[PDB]
From Swiss-Prot, chain A:
HAMAP family: ThiC. The gene is thiC. Belongs to the ThiC family. Keywords: 4Fe-4S, Iron, Iron-sulfur, Lyase, Metal-binding, S-adenosyl-L-methionine, Thiamine biosynthesis, Zinc. This is Phosphomethylpyrimidine synthase. Its EC number is 4.1.99.17. Binds 1 [4Fe-4S] cluster per subunit. The cluster is coordinated with 3 cysteines and an exchangeable S-adenosyl-L-methionine. Coiled coil: none annotated. Catalyzes the synthesis of the hydroxymethylpyrimidine phosphate (HMP-P) moiety of thiamine from aminoimidazole ribotide (AIR) in a radical S-adenosyl-L-methionine (SAM)-dependent reaction. It comes from Caulobacter vibrioides (strain ATCC 19089 / CIP 103742 / CB 15) (Caulobacter crescentus).
Length: 519, 523
């Protein structure tokens, strides 16, 4: 509590300052960016950089993790008139005022539902502003890139955001119970986003949360297992300005003392409700691990490597019945749409080795995920699809084409891929290669990999390394795609290099203090 | 005294988890071709895994290292045996290395001497069999084979034979950098149809540099370049070459420039010429030479974001603008070939006009130079000199294939040798990563050798630890390319380590990684 209050890193990002752009449709919005001014003699405008760090890097805002972040999104949600306060919330150190919400009976609360109704929500304008990086349409816009048939506009408008969401091609993860959130969008026609994984002291985890988003993590997932992951997660969500994801089966397994066999729908249901009221923005759910797909993995070089996938497979095998997450998929949807939680359909059968890439198991699950996508959309629930994994370079394009076709252009969310298995200790690098390429091919979010992958638990230095690696991978992809806003950054830093403006070069880099130190 | 400094600092002995093994030549029965081998747990019932090993005798317990004497000159006797070279009457003489045991050689007038000349003459040399054996990683030659990859129209065989190697050299599509005066060399091949090689740069105390050489090759550097500037550069380089089992490259203009006291305008042919001969006799295996930076090309760089970033290129640009004359490396190219051919030194045609930023990638100057390199290539071949081509640079991902396409066409499939490329400019201090991305991709598209990049790129001088990070980063990039190309030897390594991860054989997982000590420590 107090041990965290000091250990966490706050203050402006070295070389820059927090700036805000206000909304027009919703005049009270303040959309955050960070700004990097260069030498006056350079005679250039400051450079605007996308910033997921939150109020933590704004000295005007008092931080107190014991109280949580300001709930600056709560008012915009209540004002829509479709949510009511939950009379008696579910209940499980404890986090020390916050009302808990749920859609009114018969009301529609998801971003997808709103978008299909023709409605531009506050979150949507928020995202449109955020995605433009304060660029003005004052100069001609010439595209240099190859985006493989994507529809990235010269300039994002709130109406474009609504169009993308309504068609299922973008999502805004935004539980009505995460009032702290600074809205972001995931989708091919926007900037490539990245995810940081946290989870095994409360301070340590909040710390990694703040550290991860300080350096550019766009979402964070709390992958905690073991004792007291509910209370733990309170501390993270209340103090997070980025979307927070989870794998609900992890906690459900704990309730049944780590026995996959003893898992059931009731425990999983209770867990969902608990996490919905908590403010979790997306759930990874391995509903595509079907009974008959499991024997397809017996011949694999590395079997089933997914944690969530292994758990479901163990249940299916012990009972010899169809995956109950797959079975109750409609009932899962009826819960999530009441709070606007997004689906992240998991790859239980992802390749754990390049030998296993693009095999029958992986693709069978993938095509099943596409089917479930349409069922999710019918209930008005937003979706993204999870991908591999270990994939040699010549198979990465093929991964992307299978997803695009079989999953109806829903956003893709990958773990790497790692492009070779032979370099433990450097897996952030083997995966950065695969991550940059697949993002180029159209992947919307990249889950990070740290050097400790396959070996140990990431400390806050491994977290940073991972985040910086994936930020540069994501940006390399934006640039190759010809994203309208990518090359101003590269050109700014390159003009500084040219003129020997060493300080501007450091301040414009993903990691200014490391660059200055090495110089 | 320097010798104590050196012998104490350098890392020697078995590479953790593996042991030096040799395969004997058959065409040349005295050849001993090195690999390293990693045995896995007996309960796995698997043969040891054979790994390509450029570490040299430093990790061979059968050999007693002694830097004062240099490395075993195991190559001298095969060179001499051909009867095409003779001792130099009066060798050029420039902490000095005790170079008393080494005869210096030069081609006899009218004799064949270069690997390219022998190859075109239908001759299979000791270096050719050596590399063919090496490239096979001790795999079984009489075996059905089916390849899973996409090599974009390469000509990779299921199994490398000495004649395949000869054929590749003769058409100019592969080289073997091997100066007759580098008797310590363990021969290696560079070519699209062989394993992707990597290069580590060192240079700026002698013991500092010899350590980096040993450290670099220990972790998998296939060649090394001594990019030293300033004073003592000839004498330092003695300590490197005599103690290198890998090919050593330089950029001769760096030294030529020092002889004329930093003034690029005072360079001239006489000083360049004398530099070439000195390094030829020293045993330098390849010369990066920026002969494509032509006078009319220089104003094209004016419209660039970062202009001319090549050090060698900038030096030549300065000379040209000052004397208002065509690049003399270009004008006297013929004479340069006649010198190199007499010692079998390979050309590395430098990219003086490479893009220093993604913005300038694939522009007029870059490609104008590339087509010129392509024309110099034919002239070099006419003189019987081996050639590889140097390339970018900073290039965003979507422009990378186009680079390979232009190179293959205009430079007639000669081997390509890239520095990265870096695929974005905004991560100083992580440029080994931004460039690993480009390097793996262009390796996949057919690039033969990848010049590495460390976290210090653009910022500082790499220390011991930066050199290793760069080397490991490029080894995995080069391997990622081999795997994606469907190279017949690549999958075995990845599969072995994946079986170890699956069966929870931690020791084996550690030992089969590019960096065993790190993995064990992280675990
Ligand atoms: O599938 P398992 O349970 O192994 O791993 C879940 C974690 O891996 C991430 N992921 C992303 C794509 N595939 C998997 C997912 O977002 C979460 O961070
Ligand atoms: O062009 P300059 O003189 O800056 O750099 C030459 C170094 O950079 C390497 N290189 C490789 C491809 N392009 C450049 C070349 O092999 C040598 O190692």
């Amino acid at each position: 509590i107090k041990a965290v209050a000091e250990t966490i890193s706050t203050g402006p990002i070295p070389g820059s300052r927090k700036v805000y752009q206000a909304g027009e449709l919703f005049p009270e919005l303040r959309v955050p960016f960070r700004e990097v001014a260069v030498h006056p003699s350079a005679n250039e405008p400051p450079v605007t950089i996308y910033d997921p760090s939150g109020p933590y890097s704004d000295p005007a805002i008092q931080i107190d993790i014991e109280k949580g972040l300001p709930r600056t999104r709560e008012a915009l949600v209540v004002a829509r008139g479709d949510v009511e306060e939950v009379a008696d919330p579910r209940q499980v150190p404890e986090f020390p005022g916050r009302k808990i919400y749920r859609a009114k009976p018969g009301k529609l609360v998801t971003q997808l539902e709103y978008a299909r109704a023709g409605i531009i929500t506050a979150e949507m304008e928020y995202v449109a502003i955020r995605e433009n990086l304060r660029r003005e349409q004052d100069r001609p816009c010439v595209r240099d890139g190859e985006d493989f048939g994507a529809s990235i506009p010269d300039f994002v408008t709130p109406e474009f955001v609504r169009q993308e969401i309504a068609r299922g091609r973008a999502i805004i993860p935004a539980n009505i119970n995460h009032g702290e959130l600074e809205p972001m969008a995931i989708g091919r026609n926007f900037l490539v986003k990245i995810n940081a994984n946290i989870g095994n002291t409360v301070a340590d985890e909040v710390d990694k949360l703040v550290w991860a988003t300080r350096w550019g993590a766009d979402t964070v997932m709390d992958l905690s297992t073991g004792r007291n992951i509910h209370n733990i997660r309170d501390w993270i969500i209340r103090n997070s300005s980025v979307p927070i994801g989870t794998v609900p089966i992890y906690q459900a397994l704990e309730k049944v003392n780590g026995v996959a066999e003893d898992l059931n729908w009731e425990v999983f249901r209770d867990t969902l409700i608990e996490q919905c009221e908590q403010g979790v923005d997306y759930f990874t759910i391995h509903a595509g691990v079907r009974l008959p797909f499991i024997p397809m993995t017996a011949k694999r070089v590395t079997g089933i490597v997914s944690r969530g996938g292994s758990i479901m497979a163990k249940w299916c095998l012990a009972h010899h019945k169809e995956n109950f997450l797959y079975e109750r998929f409609d009932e899962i949807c009826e819960i999530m749409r009441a709070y606007d939680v997004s689906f992240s359909l998991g790859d239980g059968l992802r390749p754990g080795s390049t030998a296993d890439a693009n095999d029958e198991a992986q693709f069978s699950e993938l095509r099943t995920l596409g089917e479930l996508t349409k069922v999710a959309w019918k209930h008005g629930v937003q979706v993204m699809i999870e991908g591999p994994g270990h994939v040699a370079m010549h198979k990465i394009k093929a991964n992307m084409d299978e997803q695009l076709k079989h999953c109806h252009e829903a956003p893709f969310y990958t773990l790497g891929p790692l492009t070779t298995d032979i370099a433990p200790g450097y897996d952030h690098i083997t995966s950065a290669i695969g991550a940059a390429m697949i993002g180029w091919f159209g992947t919307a979010m990249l889950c990070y990999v740290t050097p400790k992958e396959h070996l140990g638990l990431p400390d806050r230095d491994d977290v940073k390394t991972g985040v910086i690696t994936y930020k540069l991978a994501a940006h390399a992809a934006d640039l190759a795609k010809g994203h309208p806003g990518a090359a101003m950054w590269d050109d700014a830093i390159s003009r500084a290099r040219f003129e020997f403006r060493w300080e501007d070069q450091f301040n414009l880099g993903l990691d200014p203090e490391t660059a200055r130190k090495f110089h």
